[PDB]
């Protein structure tokens, strides 16, 4: 019933790598006239989506050879042969025969090294104080893969709240990722506390990067 | 040559409606049929409707009826989709696009997207923290953008020379105000030596602040 699904939801490839994305759609969404309209999409970051593929396997003037789509009836494939950095983005298969229908896409990461971030924290700024707010920031920069995890401590304890995190999309040039995380609370309770810690466990690592700094320092 | 110019960002309040154009040159525009397309932020993309200027022949997406109205005006080759009874569900960035026959059966051409943000707040001037260090070869300093609404919002560091070992993350919803942050990193023979300056442009306001990173101690 006209549901178009992809998997996976990532995937991960290091460069000159193959990769394959599927889609499968509910029913048979052969047209009447004997043809099938399925095409692919790619939308790297802030863009506008590009066409990549038509009729299943029919390329669009000015794609690579590295792309090809192929399968029928229910179940179509979209292969990279070889995976360039230009390459990463999100793949979204659409069905074109009436009630035009989008699969959820399938995001392309490029594998790289694994590399720990880069943690930095700073204190809140005598300007913000001044407006009676109190801001806490940590960066963790340039890490590869993802998947990371930061715990912000106020003199040992676990504070959830007024914890606000932001991530960017893989770097084209490094293929790392970044994150900030703010920990935001009001000056009278910034000033009631001494020592404000960042934690992030990561896959490159047991032992946690911890960053913090003493209000009484 | 083909080229779908379309209107500028929209801040709308819940309840309204939009109208937002599709400008195309470089086909017959009433020989073929014009897509609709809305994605919302950190989403896929999604069919609404579609209409053939030649006519005004129109087909909606079931979810789309009543919510969507397309027109298109010949004489201005110009295709529009009006979005009524607005709600935070249709902030989004809508795209325009025309689907080819012949040389290719697909959207080979997109316009390059409208934003809509639907919302009942007013227009807020960021407030701009340094992020210095409390106390290695390089350093990391940082811009706090605090408090705004709605986006976007431009980010530089000296006015643009400082470019490399920046990353500017995505901005986050603080209660109905947005909040992002800017980090940098350079040599430490170039700061705190030389000063270092966040430029903060904030449209919607016609804002431009700039702030010296001071060192601290």
């Known amino acids: 019933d006209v549901l178009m699904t992809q998997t996976p939801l990532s995937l991960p490839v290091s460069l000159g790598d193959q990769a394959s994305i599927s889609c499968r759609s509910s029913?048979?969404?052969?047209?009447?006239?004997?043809?099938?309209?399925l095409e692919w999409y790619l939308q790297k970051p802030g863009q506008s989506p590009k066409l990549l593929i038509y009729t299943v396997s029919n390329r669009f003037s000015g794609v690579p050879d590295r792309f090809s789509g192929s399968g029928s009836g229910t179940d179509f494939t979209l292969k990279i042969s070889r995976v360039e950095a230009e390459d990463l983005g999100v793949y979204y298969c659409?069905?074109?025969?009436?009630?035009?229908?989008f699969g959820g896409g399938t995001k392309l990461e490029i594998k790289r090294a694994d590399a720990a971030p880069t943690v930095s924290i700073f204190p809140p700024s005598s300007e913000q104080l001044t407006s009676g707010g109190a801001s806490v920031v940590c960066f963790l920069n340039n890490f590869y893969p993802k998947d990371i995890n930061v715990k912000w401590k106020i003199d040992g304890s676990e504070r959830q709240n007024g914890v606000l995190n932001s991530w960017t999309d893989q770097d084209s040039k490094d293929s790392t990722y970044s994150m900030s995380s703010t920990l935001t609370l009001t000056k009278d309770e910034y000033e009631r506390h001494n020592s404000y810690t960042c934690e992030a466990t990561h896959k490159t690592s047991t032992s946690p990067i911890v960053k913090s700094f003493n209000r009484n320092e | 040559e083909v080229q779908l110019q379309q209107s500028g960002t929209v801040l709308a309040r819940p309840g309204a409606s939009v109208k937002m154009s599709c400008k195309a040159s470089?086909?017959?525009?009433?020989?073929?049929?014009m897509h609709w397309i809305k994605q919302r932020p950190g989403q896929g993309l999604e069919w609404i409707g579609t209409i053939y200027p030649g006519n005004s022949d129109t087909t909606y997406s079931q979810k789309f009826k009543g919510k969507a109205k397309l027109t298109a005006v010949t004489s201005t080759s110009t295709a529009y989709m009006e979005l009524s009874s607005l709600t935070n569900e249709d902030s989004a960035v809508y795209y325009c696009?025309?689907?080819?026959?012949?040389?290719?059966?697909?959207?080979?051409?997109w316009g390059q997207g409208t934003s809509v943000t639907v919302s009942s707040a007013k227009t807020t001037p960021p407030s701009v923290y340094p992020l210095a260090p409390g106390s290695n070869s390089m350093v990391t300093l940082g811009c706090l953008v605090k408090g705004y609404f709605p986006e976007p919002v431009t980010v530089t560091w000296n006015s643009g020379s400082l470019s490399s070992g920046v990353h500017t993350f995505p901005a986050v919803l603080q209660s109905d105000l947005y909040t992002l942050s800017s980090s940098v990193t350079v040599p430490s023979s170039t700061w705190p030596s030389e000063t270092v300056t966040c430029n903060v442009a904030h449209p919607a306001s016609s804002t431009k602040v700039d702030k010296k990173i001071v060192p601290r101690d």
């Open positions: 470089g086909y017959t525009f009433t020989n073929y049929w």
């Open positions: 659409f069905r074109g025969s009436h009630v035009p229908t």
């Open positions: 696009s025309r689907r080819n026959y012949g040389s290719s059966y697909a959207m080979d051409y």
């Open positions: 029913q048979n969404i052969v047209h009447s006239n004997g043809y099938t309209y």
